[PDB]
Design a protein around this ligand. Sequence first.
Ligand SMILES: NC(=O)c1ccc[n+]([C@@H]2O[C@H](COP(=O)([O-])OP(=O)(O)OC[C@H]3O[C@@H](n4cnc5c(N)ncnc54)[C@H](OP(=O)(O)O)[C@@H]3O)[C@@H](O)[C@H]2O)c1
Ligand SMILES: CCCc1nc(N)nc(N)c1Cc1cc(/C=C/C(=O)N2N=Cc3ccccc3[C@@H]2C=C(C)C)c(OC)c(OC)c1
Length: 163
Amino acid sequence: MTLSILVAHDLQRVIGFENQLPWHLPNDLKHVKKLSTGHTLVMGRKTFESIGKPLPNRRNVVLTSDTSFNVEGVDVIHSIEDIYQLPGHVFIFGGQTLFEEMIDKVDDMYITVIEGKFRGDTFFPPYTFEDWEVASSVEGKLDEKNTIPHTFLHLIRKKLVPR
Ligand SMILES: NC(=O)c1ccc[n+]([C@@H]2O[C@H](COP(=O)([O-])OP(=O)(O)OC[C@H]3O[C@@H](n4cnc5c(N)ncnc54)[C@H](OP(=O)(O)O)[C@@H]3O)[C@@H](O)[C@H]2O)c1
Ligand SMILES: CCCc1nc(N)nc(N)c1Cc1cc(/C=C/C(=O)N2N=Cc3ccccc3[C@@H]2C=C(C)C)c(OC)c(OC)c1
């Protein structure tokens, strides 16, 4: 319905390594909890297995081809097309495969740019700021617990108009 991407990627758009996040950043976890609370998270199967259980107080939706999939607290879908029937604010939550499938369909993106270069094996698709308006850009606060510089972006797809 209202369709957003929600993602953390590094300076080279790495989002993951060995089915885990490359970095430890509690503030971003806090950012995710705040944004998606009361809403819906759609994620691919590997992302779900990585987390290992549903996130509380959210509708959790998992896209998989596995007809045997029936986890407590999770709604299953089997097609991309299923996503557009989900009501409310829906966040595309990962991973790489779902980002690639959805980045041209979403209204907007909440991206946490991790200002570092990590070793990765999964990536967020390339995108241009030519196409995305910076609705907001907020530096994350560093401290003892959060030690990689990072920036919370809210990007909104630009309309194509005649010049
Ligand atoms: N930094 C971030 O913000 C962020 C966000 C989330 C995850 N990540 C990460 O991203 C990584 C995983 O990415 P990934 O691409 O390999 O896996 P993934 O997107 O999480 O999910 C992979 C799977 O979802 C399925 N799927 C995708 N499209 C489908 C369709 N059209 N119809 C039916 N099923 C479909 C399949 O499940 P089946 O094989 O069971 O059919 C597929 O193999 C990890 O390393 C992880 O840590 C990071
Ligand atoms: C950690 C953030 C990763 C990420 N970042 C961004 N920007 N986009 C994103 N789309 C994600 C996705 C993402 C997520 C997570 C973590 C989820 C999680 O542990 N919570 N999610 C919300 C939630 C809701 C209710 C209760 C508890 C939680 C809990 C937060 C705590 C306070 C403990 C994750 O596991 C570490 C992970 O690994 C592949 C990926």
